[PDB]
């Protein structure tokens, strides 16, 4: 996260770290959506241009974390993967359309003060909150700058941007399954996701029921926190049917 701040303890209890087993390293962010399901970006697991194609046994999920590199004894929980599900129409060839994946845990994680699932939006919360100017919150352990690395989880609040401004900021083809967020050059303020924040959540707190909802997944950006560029996020509500179909069929 660029130009963010240290998270508060327990501020993002749905935050998940995807961790490579050997070499032991951060692979991506992710989020907890129930005691056995974790949501992330498909490109965190499958991206053939970079020879990335991870299998269940290649990875671990670390939940309840704050510190990036420490083993947070008696706080974090580490889970193994039972199965990965990538959207069948994820477009890694072109523009990362439908950049979404689900991971089912081998065993349920115990909720705690530090471990708690985020809500996924229904149509009405989506329609109400996904408006230009409305702000969401992005969290992650990725780079602090486009190229150090953070000691602890980083947070930044960023406004959703008008679809024409998103489109005009890039040569990549944008789809309805994406939205972009970030400040404009004339807004003063700045901040962005960066490498390592991929797969983490974009969340909004509903003013109707005071619950947090995950509206986006950190997907892609050209650079990090560059003026006149914006972070792009998978539109979670647009892919809800697929999420539901996976969890309904595979439990």
């Amino acid at each position: 996260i660029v130009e963010g701040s240290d998270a508060e303890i327990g501020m993002s209890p749905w935050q998940v770290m995807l961790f490579r087993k050997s070499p032991q390293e951060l692979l991506c962010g992710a989020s907890l959506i129930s005691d056995r399901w974790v949501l992330t970006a498909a490109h965190c697991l499958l991206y053939p241009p970079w020879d990335k194609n991870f299998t269940e046994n290649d990875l671990l999920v670390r939940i309840g974390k704050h510190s990036r590199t420490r083993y947070e004894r008696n706080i974090e929980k580490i889970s193994m993967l039972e199965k990965i599900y990538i959207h069948p129409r994820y477009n890694w060839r072109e523009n990362l359309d439908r950049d979404i994946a689900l991971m089912k845990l081998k065993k349920p994680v115990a909720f705690s003060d530090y471990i708690h699932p985020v809500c996924l939006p229904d149509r009405e919360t989506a329609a109400s909150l996904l408006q230009a100017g409305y702000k969401g919150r992005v969290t992650g352990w990725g780079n602090l700058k486009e190229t150090g690395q953070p000691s602890v989880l980083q947070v930044v609040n960023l406004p959703i941007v008008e679809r024409p401004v998103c489109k005009d900021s890039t040569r990549i083809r944008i789809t309805d399954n994406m939205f972009c967020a970030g400040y404009k050059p004339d807004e003063g303020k700045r901040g962005d996701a960066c490498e390592g924040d991929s797969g983490g959540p974009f969340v909004m707190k509903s003013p109707f029921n005071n619950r947090w909802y995950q509206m986006g997944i950190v997907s892609w950006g050209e650079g990090c926190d560059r003026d006149g560029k914006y972070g792009f996020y998978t539109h979670v509500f647009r892919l809800k049917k697929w999420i539901q179909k996976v969890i309904d069929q595979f439990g």
Binding site: Q24, R68, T69, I78
Partner: peptide
Amino acid sequence: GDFEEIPEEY
């Protein structure tokens, strides 16, 4: 090489 070793069990 940054990360604290996690328990072998995992």
